[PDB]
Write a protein that binds this ligand. Structure first.
Ligand SMILES: *C/C=C(C)/C=C/C=C(C)/C=C/C1=C(C)CCCC1(C)C
Ligand SMILES: *C/C=C(C)/C=C/C=C(C)/C=C/C1=C(C)CCCC1(C)C
Ligand SMILES: *C/C=C(C)/C=C/C=C(C)/C=C/C1=C(C)CCCC1(C)C
Ligand SMILES: CCCCCCCCCCCCC
Ligand SMILES: CCCCCCCCCCCCC
Ligand SMILES: CCCCCCCCCCCCC
Ligand SMILES: CCCCCCCCCCCCC
Ligand SMILES: CCCCCCCCCCCCC
Ligand SMILES: CCCCCCCCCCCCC
Ligand SMILES: CCCCCCCCCCCCC
Ligand SMILES: CCCCCCCCCCCCC
Ligand SMILES: CCCCCCCCCCCCC
Ligand SMILES: CCCCCCCCCCC
Ligand SMILES: CCCCCCCCCCC
Ligand SMILES: CCCCCCCCCCC
Ligand SMILES: CCCCCCCCCCC
Ligand SMILES: CCCCCCCCCCC
Ligand SMILES: CCCCCCCCCCC
Ligand SMILES: CCCCCCCCCCC
Ligand SMILES: CCCCCCCCCCC
Ligand SMILES: CCCCCCCCCCC
Ligand SMILES: CCCCCCCCCCC
Ligand SMILES: CCCCCCCCCCC
Ligand SMILES: CCCCCCCCCCC
Ligand SMILES: CCCCCCCC
Ligand SMILES: CCCCCCCC
Ligand SMILES: CCCCCCCC
Ligand SMILES: CCCCCCCC
Ligand SMILES: CCCCCCCC
Ligand SMILES: CCCCCCCC
Ligand SMILES: CCCCCCCC
Ligand SMILES: CCCCCCCC
Ligand SMILES: CCCCCCCC
Ligand SMILES: CCCCCCCC
Ligand SMILES: CCCCCCCC
Ligand SMILES: CCCCCCCC
Ligand SMILES: CCCCCCCC
Ligand SMILES: CCCCCCCC
Ligand SMILES: CCCCCCCC
Ligand SMILES: CCCCCCCC
Ligand SMILES: CCCCCCCC
Ligand SMILES: CCCCCCCC
Ligand SMILES: CCCCCCCC
Ligand SMILES: CCCCCCCC
Ligand SMILES: CCCCCCCC
Ligand SMILES: CCCCCCCC
Ligand SMILES: CCCCCCCC
Ligand SMILES: CCCCCCCC
Ligand SMILES: CCCCCCCC
Ligand SMILES: CCCCCC
Ligand SMILES: CCCCCC
Ligand SMILES: CCCCCC
Ligand SMILES: CCCCCC
Ligand SMILES: CCCCCC
Ligand SMILES: CCCCCC
Ligand SMILES: CCCCCC
Ligand SMILES: CCCCCC
Ligand SMILES: CCCCCC
Ligand SMILES: CCCCCC
Ligand SMILES: CCCCCC
Ligand SMILES: CCCCCC
Ligand SMILES: CCCCCC
Ligand SMILES: CCCCCC
Ligand SMILES: CCCCCC
Ligand SMILES: CCCCCC
Ligand SMILES: CCCCCC
Ligand SMILES: CCCCCC
Ligand SMILES: CCCCCC
Ligand SMILES: CCCCCC
Ligand SMILES: CCCCCC
Lengths: 238, 238, 238
């Protein structure tokens, strides 16, 4: 943690803090919720920042950091991010899928595709041959594009099915997802794990901003809506 | 396995044996059970000691043992225990949750909180900076306390819901869980992975006694009850 | 990847290719399927070769290869296969279980037993003490035999239950499974990870042929049948 990771500590520290407080806020928010469906959205959404909190701390303390030889050098790689995403990204997808009461088959596809995206991202992050790192990047990107596709096609129906009553929240949470998520591959490609055009320091800041928005930001919007209570034809505001 | 792990072999061996026989006994016990719900409790409960059997053997053979530098020394750490618990603790929680027909949202919360408890416990077990090991211990402990809380609040209802007919078993299995589980953090804190007040030898014995009671002990009580067959208003003793 | 793995590259390359094309074919095949149940079989079955594709490539590029000291030598071990199987074997079992609408309890048992089979296989593959490698092999084999057993007993009922209408597909997919799966333990035992009677080169070819048949082969048969649409009393050919 001397020359490996240090300048970026500030972002890691802020990251940890913002994720901790977010978890505590959603935790308090969920107290009292007796609604079955509401219970699902709270559990899922609370765990997301909780898990990230854990991994951000591992990176801050230096545990979730490792050196990867490539390009003829020792490159500081935060593998901890993948352990985080492995569980948080599928969970966020569960939030969107549950809103529209997606089919099991669609959930499985979304989850599997995400595991591939993260798993291949991790392999690319640890791959010793530079050129091959981008081969893994391309496959993970295809996995992501598959996911984005599913979220926009064959995932809704207003004819009393998936988006018949209150689907406005889903549309907004979908907008954020596609926008934020699509930024990760770019950051990775230009940062320390990729071309190295942006220093690890700036890379960390970007991932911190993206993570907090995709977890806490995403969470705030979802847990404030009325869509988490009713889908048939009952809002349930209070 | 020379100076790293040796004196504790006896407990590891006994551990392995008691877990093996327990798995074989539950295995035989489940033969014939056609009851759907009963089938769930048998599958879950049989797998628990089966998994532990595997990990206890890995520790006995030396595979699930690693050296962790901290406190200015090479500390023998049985990481295998975490691989065990990662799967067995959520499974035990599934047994309790299924008994009371808990909500999905509650199951998710219980499972997620457990994964955090185990994951953070593992990170603390492998952390190179001594003082930081206890930071991970505190977080894992909070996760555990969260779980214990859930098991005692907003997890029952006699008004024909969660604990309307036969909930006596749940109460007894809950008593054992809170008592045994709460002992793990103490053992860890005073043993080899923590302060080092108790030798690894005695630590292993304690974890062996606790594990067998929380798995086989817990299993015997559950698989003998009638609660595994009926919940509505039918015991189904024979 | 110099003396460790090289001669076997051809099989790894072919493996990668056959798995890629298989995934792409099932992908195209699933386009349009609106049937809920059909959706499950397509998702599961498509992901299988997709995951294997990823791991076959990791082995081809050298990432999923490691050296394991035993027998007084450095033995080239493709650990990547276990990461593949960890997810693909349970998924294939889900296909068979879903066809007959197996009970939850039975699915859990099948899944748990498979995780043990793969996990113990992995430990045996990485174990440093030669003789102990076969102890792990025996346990994994018992796990496999348990699975085969379940697939042939207490897994069907023509009296309007599990195999009342179209169970012919299940019988054929069961025949292939038991035959192909039973070959893996033999190959492992006689190959590089075991006795070393068959060179790693030939071992790889065998696993490649077995994998493609158990994934793509198995997939083609399943995704062409009408059983994936109806079970009650409706084929749904077109
Ligand atoms: C809380 C974190 C979230 C929502 C993270 C999402 C991450 C991604 C969409 C990352 C995807 C990647 C690729 C498509 C290519 C390879 C590198 C990754 C892992 C950055
Ligand atoms: C079969 C094993 C069982 C039921 C094990 C349960 C384990 C725990 C409740 C362990 C919890 C821990 C903490 C709360 C703090 C950090 C260390 C641990 C992992 C021992
Ligand atoms: C796509 C791959 C498939 C269907 C692979 C299946 C693998 C097995 C049935 C492997 C089982 C093994 C044992 C029973 C003993 C130890 C070694 C293994 C892992 C080869
Ligand atoms: C910043 C808080 C750290 C959390 C430690 C334990 C968390 C358990 C979270 C469970 C969340 C869903 C119910
Ligand atoms: C709303 C009922 C839930 C039925 C099970 C859904 C499984 C979702 C998989 C999520 C992946 C977890 C990391
Ligand atoms: C790099 C830009 C930082 C943006 C921070 C935005 C915080 C949003 C607070 C919510 C305000 C609602 C009206
Ligand atoms: C001590 C017995 C070792 C077990 C080896 C294989 C176990 C498979 C267990 C499946 C349990 C739930 C059905
Ligand atoms: C009784 C029906 C079961 C519905 C799914 C429950 C999922 C439980 C998660 C258990 C965690 C496994 C390690
Ligand atoms: C350290 C104390 C050992 C306790 C062993 C107890 C075994 C319990 C057997 C059940 C007896 C039922 C009457
Ligand atoms: C819907 C189930 C499959 C999801 C697959 C995502 C795959 C991304 C890369 C695949 C490589 C193709 C050979
Ligand atoms: C057809 C409804 C599905 C209910 C959940 C089944 C869980 C199957 C576990 C599969 C293991 C995944 C690797
Ligand atoms: C080692 C033998 C190779 C076998 C290849 C068989 C491919 C099967 C193609 C399907 C033909 C259907 C009539
Ligand atoms: C300086 C540490 C602060 C910890 C927060 C305690 C309050 C938790 C409740 C959140 C509303
Ligand atoms: C040496 C390269 C091996 C082939 C890799 C397949 C890559 C597919 C990328 C996504 C279109
Ligand atoms: C309708 C929900 C809005 C999501 C994006 C919010 C960005 C808020 C920033 C305030 C300047
Ligand atoms: C999604 C729009 C694409 C913008 C261009 C990104 C390129 C980044 C690399 C800088 C050389
Ligand atoms: C000395 C090894 C004993 C193995 C046990 C075989 C019997 C299994 C059936 C359990 C009632
Ligand atoms: C240097 C310490 C970093 C802050 C850690 C947060 C710990 C929370 C413990 C549970 C109350
Ligand atoms: C009502 C179930 C009892 C659980 C604790 C049992 C301990 C038994 C020990 C016998 C001396
Ligand atoms: C749950 C009751 C607490 C008893 C005290 C445990 C302290 C153990 C440490 C010994 C110095
Ligand atoms: C030489 C690479 C070929 C890639 C395949 C592109 C077509 C995909 C659609 C499959 C029918
Ligand atoms: C030194 C050997 C330890 C005992 C292992 C139990 C093996 C069971 C194999 C399956 C019948
Ligand atoms: C009834 C399905 C057949 C499964 C085995 C097929 C083998 C085909 C090989 C063609 C020579
Ligand atoms: C399933 C039939 C068994 C055939 C014999 C396999 C033995 C392989 C080892 C070669 C010495
Ligand atoms: C000198 C104190 C370091 C910062 C502590 C802040 C906790 C978020
Ligand atoms: C150390 C700062 C604590 C953050 C509290 C949350 C502000 C809304
Ligand atoms: C159900 C998803 C399986 C996870 C596969 C891992 C991808 C490399
Ligand atoms: C209709 C979608 C436009 C193209 C989106 C992304 C390209 C990879
Ligand atoms: C909700 C409409 C999406 C438009 C996205 C623009 C793509 C660059
Ligand atoms: C409503 C416009 C959608 C914009 C989506 C952004 C494309 C990257
Ligand atoms: C490296 C990224 C390729 C471009 C993808 C789509 C641009 C919006
Ligand atoms: C050189 C500074 C990079 C700017 C990052 C902006 C954070 C929102
Ligand atoms: C000398 C024999 C060692 C002990 C074997 C016992 C198996 C539980
Ligand atoms: C080696 C001892 C075998 C244990 C058998 C179980 C006793 C009830
Ligand atoms: C460090 C915790 C791992 C998260 C597992 C996710 C539980 C569904
Ligand atoms: C009502 C609960 C009493 C306190 C229990 C545990 C303290 C951490
Ligand atoms: C069933 C009542 C629980 C009392 C536990 C005592 C706490 C130290
Ligand atoms: C019925 C009394 C409950 C005791 C619980 C034990 C507290 C650690
Ligand atoms: C190290 C443990 C702190 C005390 C927890 C509750 C005592 C029953
Ligand atoms: C010095 C012996 C420790 C006692 C452990 C007791 C096992 C129940
Ligand atoms: C010289 C070209 C190597 C083989 C490429 C084939 C892709 C399947
Ligand atoms: C490089 C060969 C491509 C394979 C296409 C699939 C043949 C049916
Ligand atoms: C060594 C076996 C791992 C256990 C996985 C649990 C299956 C639900
Ligand atoms: C009725 C089954 C015959 C024996 C099968 C496998 C032996 C391990
Ligand atoms: C479908 C009948 C199975 C016979 C298998 C032969 C075993 C060697
Ligand atoms: C219909 C005959 C079944 C053959 C099964 C093969 C046994 C290994
Ligand atoms: C090494 C394998 C033992 C024999 C198993 C059953 C033969 C069909
Ligand atoms: C020496 C060649 C081994 C034969 C392997 C056959 C592939 C089906
Ligand atoms: C030396 C490799 C043997 C493989 C022969 C042909 C495989 C079909
Ligand atoms: C990022 C801080 C989370 C709390 C928002 C109210
Ligand atoms: C502790 C604050 C409670 C928040 C209620 C909405
Ligand atoms: C579960 C932690 C995995 C670490 C990845 C390098
Ligand atoms: C669970 C471990 C995640 C890290 C991957 C190397
Ligand atoms: C690696 C992630 C596993 C996905 C489980 C649904
Ligand atoms: C690099 C892939 C970007 C995808 C755009 C949505
Ligand atoms: C220094 C400001 C940090 C906030 C990140 C968006
Ligand atoms: C610990 C031994 C398990 C069997 C109890 C009958
Ligand atoms: C092999 C013993 C059978 C047990 C029946 C209860
Ligand atoms: C799956 C085995 C993980 C080992 C942890 C150090
Ligand atoms: C599955 C691996 C568990 C060990 C963690 C280091
Ligand atoms: C690491 C444990 C995963 C939890 C799956 C429900
Ligand atoms: C160290 C935590 C103990 C919890 C008591 C139930
Ligand atoms: C020597 C006795 C071991 C039993 C553990 C409770
Ligand atoms: C092995 C090739 C897969 C495609 C079969 C049509
Ligand atoms: C691209 C080919 C389409 C296949 C339709 C069955
Ligand atoms: C998730 C990858 C694990 C690698 C096993 C050695
Ligand atoms: C997820 C990691 C699989 C490799 C086991 C060592
Ligand atoms: C290691 C495989 C986990 C099984 C999840 C159902
Ligand atoms: C080595 C085990 C073979 C099993 C035969 C079906
Ligand atoms: C060289 C032929 C390869 C096909 C494997 C069955």
């Amino acid at each position: 943690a001397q020359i490996t990771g240090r300048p970026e500590w500030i972002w890691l520290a802020l990251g940890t803090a913002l994720m901790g407080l977010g978890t505590l806020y959603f935790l308090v928010k969920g107290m009292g919720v007796s609604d079955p469906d509401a219970k699902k959205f709270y559990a899922i959404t609370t765990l997301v920042p909780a898990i990230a909190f854990t991994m951000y701390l591992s990176m801050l303390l230096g545990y979730g950091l490792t050196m990867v030889p490539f390009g003829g050098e020792q490159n500081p790689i935060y593998w901890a991010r993948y352990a985080d995403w492995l569980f948080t990204t599928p969970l966020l997808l569960l939030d969107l899928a549950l809103l529209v009461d997606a089919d099991q088959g669609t959930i499985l596809a979304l989850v599997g595709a995400d595991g591939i995206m993260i798993g291949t991202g991790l392999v690319g992050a640890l791959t010793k041959v530079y050129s091959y790192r981008f081969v893994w990047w391309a496959i993970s990107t295809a996995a992501m594009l598959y996911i984005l596709y599913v979220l926009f096609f064959g995932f809704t129906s207003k004819a009393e099915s998936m988006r018949p009553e209150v689907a406005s929240t889903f549309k907004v949470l979908r907008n954020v997802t596609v926008v934020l998520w699509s930024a990760y591959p770019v950051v990775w490609l230009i940062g320390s794990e990729g071309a190295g055009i942006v220093p690890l320091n700036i890379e960390t800041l970007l991932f911190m901003v993206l993570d907090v928005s995709a977890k806490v930001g995403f969470g705030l919007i979802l847990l404030r809506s009325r869509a988490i209570f009713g889908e048939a034809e009952a809002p349930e505001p209070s």
